[PDB]
Amino acid sequence: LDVLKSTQTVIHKALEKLGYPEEVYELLKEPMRLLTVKIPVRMDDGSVKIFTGYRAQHNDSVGPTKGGIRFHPNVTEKEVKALSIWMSLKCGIIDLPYGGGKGGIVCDPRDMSFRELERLSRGYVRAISQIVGPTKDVPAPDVFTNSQIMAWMMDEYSRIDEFNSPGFITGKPLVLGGSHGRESATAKGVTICIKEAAKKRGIDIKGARVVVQGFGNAGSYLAKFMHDAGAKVVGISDAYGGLYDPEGLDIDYLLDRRDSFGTVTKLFNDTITNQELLELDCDILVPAAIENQITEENAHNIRAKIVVEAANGPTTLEGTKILSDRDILLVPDVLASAGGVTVSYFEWVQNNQGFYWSEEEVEEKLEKMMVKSFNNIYEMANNRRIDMRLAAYMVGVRKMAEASRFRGWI
Amino acid sequence: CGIGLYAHLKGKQTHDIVKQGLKMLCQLDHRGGQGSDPDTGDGAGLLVQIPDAFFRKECKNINLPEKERYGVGMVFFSQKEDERKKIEKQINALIEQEGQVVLGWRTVPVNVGKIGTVAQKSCPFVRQVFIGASSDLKDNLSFERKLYVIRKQAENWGVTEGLDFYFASLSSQTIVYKGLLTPEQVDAFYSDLQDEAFVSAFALVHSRFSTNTFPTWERAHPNRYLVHNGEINTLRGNINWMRAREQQFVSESFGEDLNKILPILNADGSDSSILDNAFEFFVMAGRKPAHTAMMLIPEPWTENTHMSKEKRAFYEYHSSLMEPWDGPTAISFTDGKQIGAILDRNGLRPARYYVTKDDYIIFSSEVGVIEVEQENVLYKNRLEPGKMLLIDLEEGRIISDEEVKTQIATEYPYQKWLEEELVQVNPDPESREEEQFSDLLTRQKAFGYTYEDIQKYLIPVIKEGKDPLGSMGNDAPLAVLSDRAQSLFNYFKQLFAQVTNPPIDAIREQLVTSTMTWLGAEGDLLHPSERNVRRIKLYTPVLSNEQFYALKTIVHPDLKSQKIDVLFSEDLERGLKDMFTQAEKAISQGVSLLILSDKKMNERLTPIPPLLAVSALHQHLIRKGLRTKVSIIVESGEAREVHHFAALIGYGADAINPYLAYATYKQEIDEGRLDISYEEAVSKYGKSITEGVVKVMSKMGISTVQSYRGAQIFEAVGISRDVIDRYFSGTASQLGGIDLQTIAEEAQRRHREAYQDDYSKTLEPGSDFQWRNGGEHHAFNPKTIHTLQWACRRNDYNLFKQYTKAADEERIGFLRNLFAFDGNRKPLKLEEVESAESIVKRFKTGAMSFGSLSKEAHEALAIAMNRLGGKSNSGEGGEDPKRFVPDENGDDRRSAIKQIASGRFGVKSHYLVNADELQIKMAQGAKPGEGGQLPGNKVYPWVADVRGSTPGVGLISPPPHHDIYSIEDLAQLIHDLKNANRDARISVKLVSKAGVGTIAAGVAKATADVIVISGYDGGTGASPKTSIKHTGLPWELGLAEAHQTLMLNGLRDRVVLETDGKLMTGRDVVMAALLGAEEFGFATAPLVVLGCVMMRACHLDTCPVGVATQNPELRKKFMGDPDHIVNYMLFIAEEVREYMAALGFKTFDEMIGRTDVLHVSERAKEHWKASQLDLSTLLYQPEGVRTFQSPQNHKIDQSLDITTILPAVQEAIESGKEADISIEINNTNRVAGTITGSEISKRYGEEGLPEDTIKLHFTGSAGQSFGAFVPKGMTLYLDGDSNDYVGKGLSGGKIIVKSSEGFNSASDDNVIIGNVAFYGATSGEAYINGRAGERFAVRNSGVNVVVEGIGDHGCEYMTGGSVVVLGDVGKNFAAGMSGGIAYVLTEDVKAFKRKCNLEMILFESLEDEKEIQQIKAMLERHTAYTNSQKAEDLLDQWEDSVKKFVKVIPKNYKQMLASIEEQKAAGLSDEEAIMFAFEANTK
Ligand SMILES: Cc1cc2nc3c(=O)[nH]c(=O)nc-3n(C[C@H](O)[C@H](O)[C@H](O)COP(=O)(O)O)c2cc1C
Ligand code: F3S
């Protein structure tokens, strides 16, 4: 309910700090093209139910738009617009040629079936094919969406445009023309960011104590990368608890025994709750778990020098203020979790070029982009006495506002 | 019983090896028992290579080709000739059409007269068939494949015809002889063996035990290829999975021969035959024998940190395509030119083998099987678990297991395949939604929830991290008899292992467990590559809401998902058929995961019982050969107990999503109770349910969830035979019972009531584990309780009669209430029948744990029963020796029944000799397949002193008897106890179960005088609640089956059956007697007489009446009196006598077994579902004798003890004078010393004699359980090597074991003791000059030992004493060690850290001067008595040795010792200091 107002307020703060007039705020508060469509669908029983669609292009002054698609049964226009603005901020921070956007459908993948999902996606594309194209829009994977849906969308856009357009949609399967490393992008991004933050703060990465709560694919890949680099992991947690060992935890063995879900806790052994896990001694803390964990009570108990919010807004304003007062570096989530967007951009570039890179090349390009962006934001945040979240928002809005001013819409 | 082989490594052949193998079999014979007559052969056979020399010399009419280019067959025929020649022609036709040329046929001469009567009667005819080789068959592997094809086709044709014939073996390198023969009879019978023309490389052998007295020639092994030991507990799920994969096997080596070989296993065959069939198919498929053996019997690959990465990947890959075959087993297979030997994943059988300078490996069960030159013996090793003893005749070397395993693992890139092809289903963290229905109460009532169930089963799980406990085991009537509507789950009772296999533990043996579950579709087993492993794998069977939604939302084309509505309207058959149609349509489309959901259920659609639906789907899928292509996930609301969970997994469910339980937790958290967060609560519930599932698995012994998944380990009680065959095929049911229509009516009634529910918004209180007025009826209602108490206290007979009437009539409580007398006979006067004094001598009090009860209550029970003249009992908690002397007032607190439980707490020479009878607690009614836990808080000093443990230390009683790994070991223990107390009667305690008749027959053959059948209705001090409710069966079925089986086998006149469990009335006593009881046990009723109010809080140790609490404050409130118990027993006897007058029976043995006087009451017919039961099984009397007359002749005579030792030692023992003798002992002599120890203890007592009074010498191999129950003052110099269970139950004295005199190699590095040593001992010394076996010093409780290395699981459950290991140590050392010390020598400290189990042990380095001096003195005595070079070198280098030693001590033991030492230094008395330290520790 408050997501749109919060986004507008933070955008207003960033614009005020920049010093641009109010015309840029007036233009950027609201997405420039919101479309609501109704998608007919045929169920297995033969009955027809109508799903409500959505699509929002926050801005396209920079160039082609981009956004994900969530099959979340509570998706609404306010959430869609807020997510479009958020994606635009991500693109601005990473310095991509994207403007920003988001789509969604009001449905329930749980009760929905396989062929019915196929037909739903196909009807969605038939509905919104007019305002979507290689130079106008670019769907991407998101909540309740993955490679099969990407492939169906690609196949249908090929059918409707009568010519192959692999670069039309990102996140495709490898055989269809996908990009390698699509699953470890977030882990690689957070690895680069933690490395650079440690370098800037003087904390030696060699022997650095690390805690990774939340052991999904992101946590597993981050732990593996930290172990490869040299830093020791002194804590892991998952849905079934956690562990603790000041002198390493055999990340190789943990990954070898890693199951489908990433659960690692023993059966007949006591576990440590995340609340006490946060308090354990460590140099860097990486909350990548349920949101609203760092608050006033645990702000005084946190001990890590560097906190990276790989998740979406795991902290709160009070916790951010307390950490800033304590002089604990806080990495914004907008920069922490941009690996997915960066790898999607690389996939789009590969499709457009028609030639596919390799894992090493993707690694090098991704790390270069991440280090450059992090260095720029760190320099700006130290030049101006502000919080890193404010610096991230300000940097993200700078490119969009300046491009709009050049293009003369204002 | 056992196995054996005498192989020459280099390949040279002679008749000497065959003769030595026959001698080995003859020596092994002694292990088995006696059947109907000693001449009968329970089963034995011998295996050799093809004797081409003898064949060419003898046949004289076959042009035998070269060695490898033909095969030899062995066929068993009936006595008739028409079918013989018909089958001969048909086999020739098979060979001709397959293209091979038949060389001819031969008849084996046989000596029929050299055989016992039964085997002579069943003597089948033998003919050997010679097969030819065509030029196309270049390779002997192809030749063997064609021979296997021919054999399987012939077997298929035979079974189709219905004839009775068997192929003993058909191979080009193995010919097998076997039958119902004793080894001394085999040579005479098979006159071929006597010829001096045989030349073989190896000679495998085996002797069976034949649990039942009716075996057949075919069943007895050696099988076609391998010899098998023990039993397989997964042989139903095994067969189901194998039949499922049968339809889908495809390969190129067999071509189209799979159609011919479609039946790959014998359904009617036993475990050994089934294993041989499957193994032979796998190895013929194109895999190496070692590779397929490793595939079938894997090591513990999950939870083990001592395994290499290549091995872990190997086993992870193979577990994904083929399940493990758990159970006690010692495989020893062959393939003509290669040999192997394996133990199960837990190593539950002994295997010790020799090596000589002439390359003569002697692998056998025991050590002294044959005479060997100690100057030529080279290695004395043990086949440790997870180690492959592999031999290759052509190479003539013992190929090392490490390199075999390494190269097998590296043959393929399994690590890369696992790393790459695994599928990730990482859920979205932003897709969270705490689901709610808004009809929580309605759904809960529909699925049968109760407020009692919630508040007593769900909150306690979260609070305690484990399943909640209980006491006073279930007494409610069965679901089939209960009038109240009950879910289908209550009809199914869990099962457990009694004999032929131990119930393995879980918490302490976590390294062996494996909870990995695979979801998806298996690939081509015969040619597997990456698609067998492109599957989802889970860590726990249970699932959370987020996980379930992720699985459903996965849209990968290979891993599809389908949802099937498991609901019905009127016709259950229509519903099941429709569900099958959806399933098969989805499979045709290509799905791999099925979701059975009970959601979307309204007043018009009701849910099928999830167990029934899952079983029907699984059976249909298995029958149609598509189960391997799908994965059945189940989402049913009625899933909240570990019992329901285990039933679902066992009968097919891939995963469970207790959405109803999760919603209930959400509602409670929203309300405010259970303050813990929702996610933490969900995780804790999942972990607890997985722990419970592991516990249920451990009860049976299946250590793998994957194996248990196929395994059907439930016994329906009240389901019709037709329904069982249709949907639950393979399940055991005795009485038939309700039908599908009745089940549907019950479900519809429950659903309609729940969805009506138009009066209140509350859940009716449950009555499963407590009594609430208007709820489910219970046996002990307050009316019965206080009527019984009043009658007993008043000595009034009318009140007792009213109590009996109330307890028996007005309801259906048990099966025995459905029996009624005919009423038309000749009554006899009360003065003409046997008397009450004669009645009361056949009663028992049942085992009563001293820890569970109070001293006052226990002494009252004992005094009452002893005064009455019956037989009291003492629980597993031992007994203070002060009770063995009558008091001045005449009271006698001595217990006539001394119990020998798994703990072996108070087992001692005095404690055993001062007794009248001995029991062996194989299991109890409540917690059969589980042990116990007595934490520091509940173990008081006045209990610890009696139980021989430190005060305030949490004791652990292992579930299984570590001395009982099979019926042979049970017989050995029975003999040991009889030798310990020649003047007592041995007893065993079983529980009613399917096959209990077979187990009883086996026990009777094992020569147990008395068998006790205890129903699950019996009580218990503490046990898990689901184990209370859903374990065991009523004792009526067990007693009936045992009596029928025993008296059919002919051994019923050699044992004395008994009964106990809710024997509350003389009517119950008469029912038991008619069913075939002889003596009865009353435990729950005496407690009620004494003052117990059935409050069900014994586990809490807070009894308000002070009957089962150790607190002195509560004990002061006790009010019992032995007079009340005497009155109760007298009233029971008088009522029984009145019924004897009514029935006109003159004497006990005259009435016993007269089941013809029983007929079903009309009330059973009136009952709406109980009328569908079939009672002819219990109402049936085969001809025979029905009373104990024979004395159950033991073999105490002719023992070396009585023959030689005692006759020259009576004077020494009686005069207290020193005496020395030397004796030659062979493996046949089993115990060798327990008799002298018992004599010493009886003559003197606990004090014993001065140190080193009797110095017995010994030489050569010793027998099993050598030197058991040796008291203080004795000394057994055993200058040789021994067998298992050395020093069992030691109670003082020394035991010195040194290698042979002619053995010059590293005796400190060659094993010299069996698996288990010093089990349950209390105090003594020991000096072993060599490595020990697996589970060394299992329950040491004060015995100091010195060993040079030990096996695995060593020092498992120590509670005192000390151990000094001068060498390496196996994995999982000190698993559960709650006391004592272990000065373990080691060099690689970190490797020792990793090997040890870190749960409950703290490590140090020696700093105490007293500790150093004690170790130095122990090593000095060790060297002085042994002359060990390792010990001498350690003494020389003491300076380095003190630094290199490592000390291990538990935290609680260390803290208690420190506190008591501090108090003693302060200067307080021992008792007060102990009490103060205990209070401080357990505040
Ligand atoms: C409080 C209590 C404790 C028991 N403890 C043991 C025990 O430690 N070992 C055992 O074998 N049976 C134990 N039992 C079971 C009885 O000894 C006996 O085997 C039988 O179950 C009693 O049946 P009943 O309820 O008709 O008296 C116990 C029973 C009760 C009620
Ligand atoms: S059930 Fe147990 S707690 Fe006391 S009242 Fe009876 S002995």
- Kindly give, in sequence order, each residue whose CB lies less than 8 Å from that of residue B399, ignoring residues fewer than 6 positions away: B390, B391, B392
Q: Which of A164, A195, A227 is the last residue of a domain?
A: A164
Same domain, A18 and A46: no
Type of residue found at B905: F
Quote the CA–CA distance of B648 and B639 in Å, as a whole number: 9
Structure token pair of residue B348: 């539950």
The single residue listed with the structure tokens 């079938």 is B296
CATH superfamily of B782-1166: Aldolase class I (3.20.20.70)
Q: Which of A164, A193, A228 is the last residue of a domain?
A: A164
| B 288-307 near A (Cβ less than 8 A) | 302-303, 305
Strand partners, B90: none
Quote the CA–CA distance of B1218 and B1253 in Å, as a whole number: 5
Residue with CA nearest ligand 1 atom 24: B1061
Structure token pair of residue B1431: 């010990």
Same domain, A53 and A116: yes
Radius of gyration of chain B (CA): 33
**Number of alpha carbons in the 13 Å side-chain half-sphere of residue A31:** 31
Burial B510-520 (b: 16+ CB within 10 A, else e): bbbbbbbbbbb
Quote the CA–CA distance of B1326 and B1297 in Å, as a whole number: 8
- Kindly give, in sequence order, each residue whose CB lies less than 8 Å from that of residue B597, ignoring residues fewer than 6 positions away: B563, B564, B565, B566, B635
Handedness of CA A71, A75, A77, A79 (dihedral sign): negative
Structure token pair of residue B265: 């296993």
Across the interface, whether the CB atoms of B506 and A143 are under 8 A apart is answered no
**Number of alpha carbons in the 13 Å side-chain half-sphere of residue B1166:** 6
Q: What are phi and psi of B22, to 5 degrees?
A: -65, -40
- Between helices A185-201 and A339-353, what is the axis angle to 10°? 120
Quote the CA–CA distance of B1230 and B973 in Å, as a whole number: 11
Sort out which chain B residues have CB atoms less than 8 A from A216's CB and list them.
426-427, 429
Three-state SS annotation for B1180-1246: CCCCCCCCCCCCCCCCCCCCHHHHHHHHHCHHHHHHCCCEEEEEECCCCCCCCCHHHHHHHHHHCCC
Contact between A140 and A171 under an 8 Å Cβ cutoff? The reply is yes
Give residue A283's Cα distance to chain centre: 24
How close is the Cα of B1008 to the center of ligand 1, in Å? 21
Across the interface, whether the CB atoms of A240 and B683 are under 8 A apart is answered yes
Q: Residue positions of A in the annotated binding site for NAD(+)?
A: 186, 217
Neighbours of B982 (CB within 10 A): 13
What residues make up the domain containing A10?
A: 1-28+387-410
- Kindly give, in sequence order, each residue whose CB lies less than 8 Å from that of residue A319, ignoring residues fewer than 6 positions away: A294, A295, A296, A298, A299
Contacts of B1215-1223 spanning 24+ positions with Cβ under 8 A: B1216/B1249, B1216/B1253, B1218/B1252, B1218/B1253, B1218/B1254, B1218/B1255, B1219/B1254, B1219/B1255, B1220/B1255, B1220/B1257, B1221/B1256, B1221/B1257, B1222/B1257, B1222/B1258, B1222/B1259, B1223/B1256, B1223/B1257, B1223/B1258, B1223/B1259
A356 within domain boundaries: no
Query: Which string of DSSP letters, residue by residue, matches B631-656?
Result: -EEEE-SS--SHHHHHHHHHHT-S-B
A408 within domain boundaries: yes
Closest CA to B633 of B614, B607, B661, B660: B614
Q: Helix, strand or coil for residue B738?
A: strand
Contact between A31 and A109 under an 8 Å Cβ cutoff? The reply is no
How close is the Cα of B1315 to the center of ligand 1, in Å? 32
Neighbours of B951 (CB within 10 A): 20
Q: What does DSSP say about strands B1343-1347 and B1324-1325: parallel, antiparallel, or unpaired?
A: parallel
Contact between B952 and B942 under an 8 Å Cβ cutoff? The reply is no
- Between helices B309-319 and B289-296, what is the axis angle to 10°? 70
Q: What are phi and psi of B33, to 5 degrees?
A: -95, -155
The vertex-B1154 CA angle with B1153 and B1157, nearest 5°, equals: 145
Q: What are phi and psi of B45, to 5 degrees?
A: -170, 165
- Report whether residue B1377 contacts ligand 2, using a CB cutoff of 6 Å: no
Residues with CB under 6 A from ligand 1: B 846-847, 849, 852, 875-876, 921, 924-925, 989, 1014, 1018-1021, 1060-1063, 1081-1085, 1098
Q: Helix, strand or coil for residue B889?
A: coil
Domain count, chain A: 3
Chain A / chain B CB contacts < 8 angstroms: 88
Three-state SS annotation for B804-863: HHHHHCCCCCCHHHHEEECCCCCCCCCCCCCCHHHHHCCEECCCCCCCCCCHHHHHHHHH
CA distance A224 to chain B (A): 13
Same domain, A158 and A298: no
Contact between B812 and B803 under an 8 Å Cβ cutoff? The reply is no
Same domain, A191 and A287: yes
Contact between B516 and B302 under an 8 Å Cβ cutoff? The reply is yes
A194 to A243, A378, B1050: CA distances (angstroms): 22, 13, 80
How close is the Cα of B661 to the center of ligand 1, in Å? 34
Quote the CA–CA distance of B755 and B737 in Å, as a whole number: 28
Q: Where are the alpha helices (DSSP H) in B349-471?
A: 401-410, 414-421, 440-447, 451-453, 459-464
Contact between B638 and B487 under an 8 Å Cβ cutoff? The reply is yes
The vertex-A18 CA angle with A63 and A101, nearest 5°, equals: 30
Same domain, A333 and A395: no
Of all helices (H) and strands (E), which one includes residue B75?
Answer: strand B71-77
Quote the CA–CA distance of B806 and A316 in Å, as a whole number: 68
B569 to A216, B167, B575, B576, B583: CA distances (angstroms): 43, 53, 8, 11, 19
Report the structure determination method.
Answer: cryo-EM
How close is the Cα of B1019 to the center of ligand 1, in Å? 5
Sort out which chain A residues have CB atoms less than 8 A from B582's CB and list them.
none
Query: Which string of DSSP letters, residue by residue, matches B1077-1120?
Result: -SEEE-SHHHHHHHT------TTTT--TTSSS---HHHHTT---
Burial B855-871 (b: 16+ CB within 10 A, else e): bbbbbbbbbbbbbbebb
* Chain A interface includes B689 (CB < 8 A): no
B557 to A173, B215, B529, B1059: CA distances (angstroms): 12, 53, 19, 60
**Residues making up chain B, counted from first to last:** 1483
Quote the CA–CA distance of B1408 and B1308 in Å, as a whole number: 28
| Domain spans of chain B, in order of start | 2-419, 440-756, 782-1166, 1200-1475
Fold type of domain B2-419: Glutamine Phosphoribosylpyrophosphate, subunit 1, domain 1 (3.60.20)
Query: DSSP class of residue B1262?
Result: P
Of all helices (H) and strands (E), which one includes residue B1448?
Answer: strand B1445-1449
User: Would you report the helix, strand and coil content of chain A in percent, each value rounded to 5?
Assistant: 50, 10, 40
Structure token pair of residue B1377: 């060690």
| Residue B222 preceded by cis peptide, ω within 30 | yes
Quote the CA–CA distance of B1297 and B1309 in Å, as a whole number: 14
Q: Measure CB to CB from residue A144 to each of B515, B553, B1399 and give the nearest one.
A: B553
Topology alike, domains B2-419 and B782-1166: no
Type of residue found at B195: D
Structure token pair of residue B1453: 């033991």
Quote the CA–CA distance of B781 and B765 in Å, as a whole number: 17
Of all helices (H) and strands (E), which one includes residue B959?
Answer: none
Neighbours of B361 (CB within 10 A): 20
A231 within domain boundaries: yes
Same domain, A74 and A125: yes
- Kindly give, in sequence order, each residue whose CB lies less than 8 Å from that of residue B56, ignoring residues fewer than 6 positions away: B64
Q: Where are the alpha helices (DSSP H) in B247-326?
A: 257-260, 271-284, 289-296, 309-319
End-to-end CA distance of chain B: 53
Of all helices (H) and strands (E), which one includes residue B1325?
Answer: strand B1324-1325
Of B778, B1063, B1084, B1092, best ligand 1 pocket probe by most atoms within 8 Å of the beta carbon: B1084
Q: Helix, strand or coil for residue B1334?
A: coil
Q: Which of A337, A354, A373 is the last residue of a domain?
A: A337
Report the atom number in ligand 1 closest to the C-alpha of B1017: 25
- Between helices B1234-1243 and B967-980, what is the axis angle to 10°? 40
Left if phi > 0, otherwise alpha if psi is -120 to 50, otherwise beta: which for B226?
beta
Quote the CA–CA distance of B1360 and B334 in Å, as a whole number: 45
Q: Does domain B440-756 have CATH number 2.40.50.100?
A: no
Kindly identify the ligand whose nearest atom is closest to the C-alpha of B475.
Answer: 1
Neighbours of A273 (CB within 10 A): 15
Q: What does DSSP say about strands B1219-1224 and B1254-1259: parallel, antiparallel, or unpaired?
A: parallel
Quote the CA–CA distance of B1170 and B742 in Å, as a whole number: 11
Quote the CA–CA distance of A361 and A353 in Å, as a whole number: 15
Neighbours of B315 (CB within 10 A): 23
B1313 to B764, B1127, B1308: CA distances (angstroms): 61, 54, 11
Q: Measure CB to CB from residue B309 to each of A143, A214, A256 and give the nearest one.
A: A256
A365 within domain boundaries: no
* Chain A interface includes B673 (CB < 8 A): no
CA distance A261 to chain B (A): 6
Query: DSSP class of residue B511?
Result: G
Contact between B899 and B873 under an 8 Å Cβ cutoff? The reply is yes
A21 to A17, A26, B477, B1456: CA distances (angstroms): 11, 9, 84, 77
Same domain, A320 and A400: no
Same domain, A248 and A193: yes
Catalytic choice (A102, A195, A224, A232): A102
| B 450-489 near A (Cβ less than 8 A) | 465
Write down the architecture of domain B1200-1475 according to CATH.
3 Solenoid (2.160)
Quote the CA–CA distance of A293 and A304 in Å, as a whole number: 15
Q: Which of A268, A272, A274, A290 to mutate to test the interface with B (most CBs of B within 10 A)?
A: A268
Closest CA to B451 of B670, B760, B751, B777: B760
Contact between B905 and B877 under an 8 Å Cβ cutoff? The reply is yes
Q: Residue positions of A in the annotated binding site for substrate?
A: 66, 90, 344
Type of residue found at B913: V
Structure-derived torsion over alpha carbons of residues B786, B787, B793, B798, reported in degrees to the nearest 10 = 170
Across the interface, whether the CB atoms of A267 and B683 are under 8 A apart is answered no
Structure token pair of residue B314: 């190997």
Strand partners, B1286: B1317
Same domain, A196 and A320: yes
Residue with CA nearest ligand 1 atom 20: B1018
The single residue listed with the structure tokens 């028996």 is B808
Across the interface, whether the CB atoms of A72 and B431 are under 8 A apart is answered yes
Quote the CA–CA distance of B224 and B277 in Å, as a whole number: 8
CA distance B479 to chain A (A): 33
Sort out which chain A residues have CB atoms less than 8 A from B516's CB and list them.
259
- Kindly give, in sequence order, each residue whose CB lies less than 8 Å from that of residue B1291, ignoring residues fewer than 6 positions away: B908, B909, B910, B1237, B1241, B1269, B1270, B1271, B1272, B1321, B1322, B1323, B1324
A367 within domain boundaries: no
Of B858, B871, B924, B987, best ligand 1 pocket probe by most atoms within 8 Å of the beta carbon: B924
- Between helices B610-624 and B642-651, what is the axis angle to 10°? 20
Quote the CA–CA distance of B1349 and B1370 in Å, as a whole number: 8
A111 within domain boundaries: yes
B430 to A290, A291, B1253: CA distances (angstroms): 8, 9, 79
Contact between B924 and B992 under an 8 Å Cβ cutoff? The reply is no
Quote the CA–CA distance of B1106 and B1091 in Å, as a whole number: 9
Q: Measure CB to CB from residue A261 to each of B302, B425, B563 and give the nearest one.
A: B425
Type of residue found at B1428: S
A interface residues, B as partner, C-beta within 8 Å: 72, 109-111, 113-114, 117, 143-144, 146, 148-149, 183, 214, 216-218, 239-241, 253, 256-257, 259-263, 265-270, 273, 289-290, 311-312
Strand partners, A52: A38
A150 within domain boundaries: yes
- Kindly give, in sequence order, each residue whose CB lies less than 8 Å from that of residue B1112, ignoring residues fewer than 6 positions away: none
Q: Helix, strand or coil for residue A55?
A: strand
A120 within domain boundaries: yes
Same domain, A206 and A237: yes
Same domain, A21 and A39: no
Type of residue found at B1415: I
Q: Which of B415, B416, B418, B424 to mutate to test the interface with A (most CBs of A within 10 A)?
A: B424
Report the atom number in ligand 1 closest to the C-alpha of B475: 25
Q: What does DSSP say about strands B1343-1347 and B819-821: parallel, antiparallel, or unpaired?
A: unpaired
Same domain, A210 and A307: yes
Handedness of CA B28, B34, B40, B42 (dihedral sign): negative
Of all helices (H) and strands (E), which one includes residue A407?
Answer: helix A388-407
